[PDB]
Structure 1
């Protein structure tokens, strides 16, 4: 079973540096080209760098060129991406992939790299309250606003995972302040609001923040 496992991702200031790793299994990185590909949030795939099977040497995208450096360890088959002088534009999910020769037939699970001046901060959770004016037929809407957190990701559940139907947790938006914000909503029968409690469970692992907010009229 071929398998690539990544690590080393995280949060850094502009001008800082990080080192990504790529643990290979079921094969050795000697007989294959290894590539790094990144994907910024909501954007397309971008090739970063590659290294040859036999000898080393390198090929880099113009956007990187002389800021990152790809390498590998033959003994412990592991590819590396030494990122230096990072900028905000380098914020993306980074993948490592094996090229066979036809194409990148195996990919790592990917790892998030955030480059920003913002400090780590947990979300403030505010209720989006149901109301008698906020119905569509017998259906009522309610939710939770998860505001001003950094970095990604946050996870949201409702009633500890018991409530999934009708739930919409929207993609985060990057505000001008450098912090993220999103809402999670759910539609339920208005007749249930009297005898049903609704709690959004917000988890922000990067800040060790766990919040449970009850939503009521």
Structure 2
């Protein structure tokens, strides 16, 4: 019944500050090493900070210098990561984990931290229409272009979740503009183009944006 739940992740301008939280359950942080580990999109794991049991000594990666501060509240049973002077390269999913005497055997679900000068924006949704050249020998490809949103993440479903087979929702790409964009595609039988309706359901929580888009030939 051991669980770690994280919070506090979000968007900040470079040079700004953010406090992450890691709420523990089924154990108290007083008796264990607690670690913070982050992961940039597409990259490997990077250890960030740790705090010792009983006495609360700390340790930091060289990359987070005297910018980050790790601490724990044993009464509230929560560990924290105070992040100051944030830079763009600090953008990552941050995980908190419990050490057991050995390794980190329990992990949080992770929280996304985005550092950028760009401002929050809902996406524009454009159809990737099927045609005589999006088809071949029976199957046609169609999709939705989810363009110019910030920050991550965007979620996409098809026909309110009923259509999952043949669905490819690609990783978002960070455009030079500073805004993100992703495509979601699906391959369907060409004969269904006249009958079946195909709707991509786009959700962008950071802007409370919900957009449907019916994709037609």
TM-score (norm 1): 0.98
In 2: Cα distance, 1:139 partner to 1:28 partner: 55
Deviation, 1:115, is 0.5
In 2: Cα distance, 1:125 partner to 1:21 partner: 34
In 1: Cα distance, 2:174 partner to 2:133 partner: 31
In 2: Cα distance, 1:136 partner to 1:19 partner: 52
In 1: Cα distance, 2:164 partner to 2:171 partner: 17
Deviations 1:19-64 (A, max 9, x none): 0111111111111111100001111000000111121221100000
In 2: Cα distance, 1:73 partner to 1:171 partner: 37
Task: Tell me the residue number matched to 1:73.
Answer: 73
Deviation, 1:75, is 1.4
Structure 2 unaligned runs (5+)?
Answer: none
Deviation, 1:162, is 1.5
Instruction: Give me the CA root mean square deviation.
Output: 0.8
In 1: Cα distance, 2:188 partner to 2:175 partner: 30
Deviation, 1:122, is 0.6
SS at match of 1:168: strand
SS at match of 2:53: coil
In 1: Cα distance, 2:134 partner to 2:99 partner: 53
In 2: Cα distance, 1:179 partner to 1:208 partner: 17
In 2: Cα distance, 1:212 partner to 1:69 partner: 42
In 2: Cα distance, 1:5 partner to 1:165 partner: 32
Structure 1 unaligned runs (5+)?
Answer: none
TM-score (norm 2): 0.98
Deviations 1:119-158 (A, max 9, x none): 0001100010100122120111111000000011111111
Deviation, 1:159, is 1.1
Moved over 2 A (4+): none
SS at match of 2:118: coil
Pair 1:51 & 2:51 matched: yes
